[PDB]
Design a protein around this ligand. Structure first.
Ligand SMILES: CCCCCCCCCCCCCCCC(=O)O
Ligand SMILES: CCCCCCCCCCCCCCCC(=O)O
Ligand SMILES: CCCCCCCCCCCCCCCC(=O)O
Lengths: 178, 32, 10
């Protein structure tokens, strides 16, 4: 039903946006071993921006990850520093949500739903490039924390909501021609 | 043979490719 | 899609 489809799409968008914003702000991306505060190596929390010291005498103490501790490597370092790919995913998800909102009012345009689909799909692609960049730059034991998996779930949900939006637009234009 | 992250990103890529092929192939009303 | 759309003006 239109109703159920629209509700499910709207809920999906909020979930994806919230999950990606939580993930890009929280610091439990990589449970590894390192230094909590530099002027003894212990478990560390790590995130996109700051690393934190768990299990350490200075527990809870956190320091900004030192991005930039070979232009090809400079470019990866820059992209990982200013996490444009992850942050751009949040922006695209936000823009998509605005479009789905503007479907209710200012309706009958039929092209804003397609726009929402394009934004959600594009958000997924940005998210995945972000993951690849992160995983690659974090290679220069370990384990991925719950904020990493929050990011992944955002990708999946965003793709599903994208399919729903395109399908709904198709159904609209089919009803118009029926 | 392949690391865990390669497998994970293969699944992500599979979802992304499938979704994009669905979109580009069946969104234009000028082919329905 | 945009091109074919503008054409529909015809
Ligand atoms: C065609 C789609 C197939 C999807 C298959 C997914 C199956 C899930 C398997 C879970 C293994 C995850 C390993 C955990 C790694 C870790 O410790 O961080
Ligand atoms: C995996 C990512 C997305 C795959 C499934 C998307 C779910 C939305 C389905 C919308 C339309 C369903 C109708 C049908 O399958 O014929
Ligand atoms: C679409 C092609 C099918 C591929 C699906 C394979 C999913 C594998 C998921 C990861 C499990 C293997 C990696 C080891 C993880 C670990 O060390 O715990």
């Amino acid at each position: 039903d239109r109703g159920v489809q629209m509700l499910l799409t709207t809920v999906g968008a909020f979930a994806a946006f919230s999950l990606m914003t939580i993930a890009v702000g929280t610091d439990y991306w990589l449970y590894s071993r390192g230094v909590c505060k530099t002027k003894e190596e212990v478990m560390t929390h790590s995130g996109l921006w700051r690393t934190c010291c768990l299990e350490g005498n200075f527990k809870g103490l956190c320091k900004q990850i030192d991005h930039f501790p070979d232009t090809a490597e400079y470019f990866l370092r820059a992209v990982r520093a200013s996490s444009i790919f992850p942050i751009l995913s949040v922006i695209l998800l936000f823009m998509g949500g605005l479009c789905i909102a503007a479907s209710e009012f200012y309706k009958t345009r039929h092209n804003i739903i397609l726009s929402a689909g394009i934004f959600f799909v594009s958000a997924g692609l940005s998210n995945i490039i972000g993951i690849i960049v992160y995983i690659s730059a974090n290679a220069g034991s370990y384990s991925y924390g719950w904020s990493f998996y929050f990011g992944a779930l955002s990708f999946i949900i965003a793709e599903m909501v994208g399919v729903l939006a395109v399908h709904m637009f198709i159904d609209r234009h089919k009803q118009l021609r029926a | 043979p392949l690391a865990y992250e390669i497998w994970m990103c293969i699944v992500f890529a599979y979802i992304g490719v499938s979704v994009v092929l669905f979109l580009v192939s069946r969104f234009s009303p000028y082919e329905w | 899609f945009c091109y074919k759309s503008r054409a529909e003006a015809k």
